[PDB]
Design a protein around this ligand. Structure first.
Ligand code: ADP
Ligand code: ALF
Ligand code: MG
Length: 728
């Protein structure tokens, strides 16, 4: 029996709306009409259902939950849909498209663990915060080759539509998964990869593609206050296919990892998972060979007050990480080298600098220094000198500095952040060498960026993340509304322009603009000015934007913060350390020390120019900001060469709890994502069009010729959704 028609199947049980009863049938055939209204006009996102009891030519009168009757103009009313629509799979079918109506449909589905719903052309996914059995091999097989309208909403379905569009159109595709922090982007990405690896698979390669993930999550993910498994790097995964449509390989591009987390974490957060995995899961012999102990013994692990995550065993995860490294093909010596570096970082963090006779720092106890040097394979006298007495040029003269305690500690931190960041890039490079083995014919690119985030303290890391999220929202705006309406004009189909009111360009320009200069440009200029400080930097930003740019705020309550109004809301950024973060300095004497390491992995991190070298920009090294803007611009150029498919992940609440939809939290996301606007253009517009000549040869204007479902353009014929798909 076909699972899609069998009401006893797990497909029906977990992906279809449950059968209503006799009492529901009664309510469903009622002739009564209802409206969504706010009991408290100050709380615009809390709605109740009232019965419409009478009407005039221009008004409705309705009963409230408590009793009393209210009036409202017909043009301001948010009418409730007939309840036969509750649970509908595609919301472009609703008679009434308004905020509480769309939220209500998502709610009915979520209450019975139906997390996926279409909104016209894109998918909406609401995080369940629990396991639902809809990703087994048996589920994969059901979606295989099925068209969107033949099956229920699912991440698998949209993945298959991209795959078929790649085969039938011979063009590259992309799956763009949006969402604020913890919304479900990474979990959904994993399912897209799973599906494509199965439906287009032949083996070992497909397993290696899958086992790349645990390695990268171990080194690249950490507990933040918004997500227990937060991705602290962005990633674009290119799944590559041959001309026949079989998987031929994969390539991973990463985006700027949060190196600062290695040396500092806020209260309740954790460092990267890998540190806890090694300390919990190391063999008693490894622990002696690496001079390890428990987390509480290390400064880099004992400052947050949190060393574990509910429902996670770090010892079990370490076993998974190691099994992944084997399948991928990291040798046993390479693995030991990797953990020697992790262990050395921890030891470096334990070095305690103290004031000496004068202002220069000294090191009284050498225990931590010696254990680090042992595992890294470097000379401890050289390391010590490089940390506290690094040599620089003054003119052309060579002068030994003697750093104070604060500067010595900061330099040790820079070493640690460089070690960890370069290791991460090396891991990605090694994975890519294994997974990518053939020139591709086509690709489906899967984008999993770090999600929009706000904390008590927001720094340069959060500005880079949030800018990226704004750029991705504008790409949605561009393809859904802007490019769409421009086609209707060029083709004179008597289309009337609509302003959908979604435009992130002003904010994007405030951040990355070149003339006049934006925030990143002024940061770069200050970064190479020898007399610049964090105070001259914030003064410059206020001078250029305060009361001049509508997306900027100089706050009256602080002298070290500035505010940017993003699509997802206003964020206040603290300027402390931005110059040093943008320059990303590392004493050369530290690099010279580690170049002489006996370890074969440590030596590649400091001698491979693709990992250890930095591009020049005239007389200065390229800034972090300039490098990042360039990487992102290149991503966006690549996406513009694909046919994009969108998944909008929505977080239900801010507590990481299941079965708890919070009205204001969800509605804020639907508004700023442009979900309703996306539905309206899908209904009022003409998604399908093809040159008349190419239409006659497959399915000129006389030849080609229900009148409503098409319109004749200057060079193409335009169909609404419903017609062009239903004639082939
Ligand atoms: N479809 C899902 N099924 C089960 N758990 C999910 C699902 N999607 C999100 N998660 C839960 O939410 C958490 C955070 O989601 P994640 O995809 O890591 O966020 P981001 O959007 O920041 O990558 C996951 O670790 C998991 O606990
Ligand atoms: F925590 Al995320 F994208 F992994 F916001
Ligand atoms: Mg993630």
């Amino acid at each position: 029996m076909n699972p899609i028609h069998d009401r006893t199947s797990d497909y029906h049980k977990y992906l279809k709306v449950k059968q209503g009863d006799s009492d529901l049938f009664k309510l469903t055939v009622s002739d009564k009409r209802y409206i969504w209204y706010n009991p408290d006009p100050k709380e615009r996102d809390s709605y109740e259902c009232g019965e419409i009891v009478s009407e005039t030519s221009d008004s409705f009168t309705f009963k409230t939950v408590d009793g009393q009757d209210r009036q409202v103009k017909k043009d301001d009313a948010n009418q409730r849909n007939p309840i036969k629509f509750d649970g509908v799979e595609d919301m472009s079918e609703l008679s009434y498209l308004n905020e509480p109506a769309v939220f209500h449909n998502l709610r009915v589905r979520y209450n019975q663990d139906l997390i996926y719903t279409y909104s016209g052309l894109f998918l909406v996914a609401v995080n369940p915060f629990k396991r639902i059995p809809i990703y087994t091999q048996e589920m994969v097989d059901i979606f295989k080759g099925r068209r969107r309208n033949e099956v229920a909403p699912h991440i698998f379905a949209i993945s298959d539509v991209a795959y078929r569009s790649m085969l039938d159109d011979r063009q590259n595709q992309s799956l763009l998964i949006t969402g604020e922090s913890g919304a479900g982007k990474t979990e959904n990405t994993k399912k897209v990869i799973q599906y494509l690896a199965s439906v287009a698979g032949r083996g070992v390669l497909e397993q290696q593609i899958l086992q790349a993930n645990p390695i990268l999550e171990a080194f690249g993910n950490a507990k933040t206050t918004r997500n227990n498994n937060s991705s602290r790097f962005g990633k674009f995964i290119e799944i590559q296919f041959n001309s026949a449509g079989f998987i031929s390989g994969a390539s991973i591009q990463s985006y700027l990892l949060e190196k600062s987390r290695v040396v500092f974490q806020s209260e309740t957060e954790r460092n990267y998972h890998i540190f806890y995995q090694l300390l919990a899961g190391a063999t008693a012999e490894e622990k002696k060979a690496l001079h390890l102990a428990g987390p509480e013994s290390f400064n880099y692990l004992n400052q947050s007050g949190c060393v574990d995550i509910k429902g996670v065993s770090d010892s079990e995860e370490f076993k998974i990480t190691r099994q992944a490294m084997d399948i991928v093909g990291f040798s046993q010596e390479e693995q030991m080298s990797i953990f020697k570096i992790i262990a050395g970082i921890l030891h470096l963090g334990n070095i305690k600098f103290e004031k000496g006779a004068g202002e220069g720092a000294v090191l009284k106890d050498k225990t931590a220094l010696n254990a680090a040097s042992t595992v890294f394979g470097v000379n401890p006298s050289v390391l010590e000198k490089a940390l506290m007495e690094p040599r620089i040029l003054a003119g052309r003269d060579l002068v030994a500095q003697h750093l104070n305690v604060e500067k010595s500690s900061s330099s040790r931190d820079a070493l640690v952040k460089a070690l960890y960041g370069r290791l991460f890039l090396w891991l990605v490079k090694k994975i890519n060498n294994v997974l990518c083995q053939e020139r591709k014919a086509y690709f489906i690119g899967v984008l999993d960026i770090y999600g929009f985030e706000i904390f008590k303290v927001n720094s340069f890391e959060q500005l880079c993340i949030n800018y990226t999220n704004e750029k991705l929202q504008q790409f949605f705006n561009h393809h859904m509304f802007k490019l769409e309406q421009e086609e209707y004009l060029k083709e004179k189909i008597n289309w009337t322009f609509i302003d959908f009111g979604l435009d992130s360009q002003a904010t994007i320009d405030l951040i990355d603009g070149r003339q006049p200069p934006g925030i990143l440009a002024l940061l770069d200029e200050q970064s190479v000015f020898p007399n610049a400080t964090d105070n001259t930097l914030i003064t410059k930003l206020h001078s250029h934007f305060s009361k001049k740019n509508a997306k900027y705020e100089e706050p009256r309550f602080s002298k070290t913060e500035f505010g940017v109004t993003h699509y997802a809301g206003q964020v206040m950024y603290e300027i402390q350390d931005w110059l040093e973060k943008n320059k990303d300095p590392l004493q050369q004497d530290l690099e010279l020390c580690f170049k002489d390491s006996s370890d074969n992995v440590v030596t590649k991190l400091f001698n491979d120019p693709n990992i250890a070298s930095r591009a020049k920009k005239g007389a200065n090294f390229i800034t972090v900001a300039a490098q990042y803007k360039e990487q992102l611009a290149s991503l966006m150029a690549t996406l513009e060469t694909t046919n994009p498919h969108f998944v909008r992940c929505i977080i239900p609440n801010n507590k990481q709890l299941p079965a708890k939809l919070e009205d204001k939290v969800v509605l804020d996301q639907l508004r700023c994502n442009g979900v309703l606007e996306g539905i309206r253009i899908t209904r009022k517009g003409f998604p399908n069009r093809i040159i008349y000549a190419d239409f006659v040869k497959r399915y000129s204007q006389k030849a080609t010729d229900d009148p409503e479902q098409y319109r004749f353009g200057i060079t193409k014929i335009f169909f609404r959704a419903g017609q062009l798909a239903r004639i082939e």
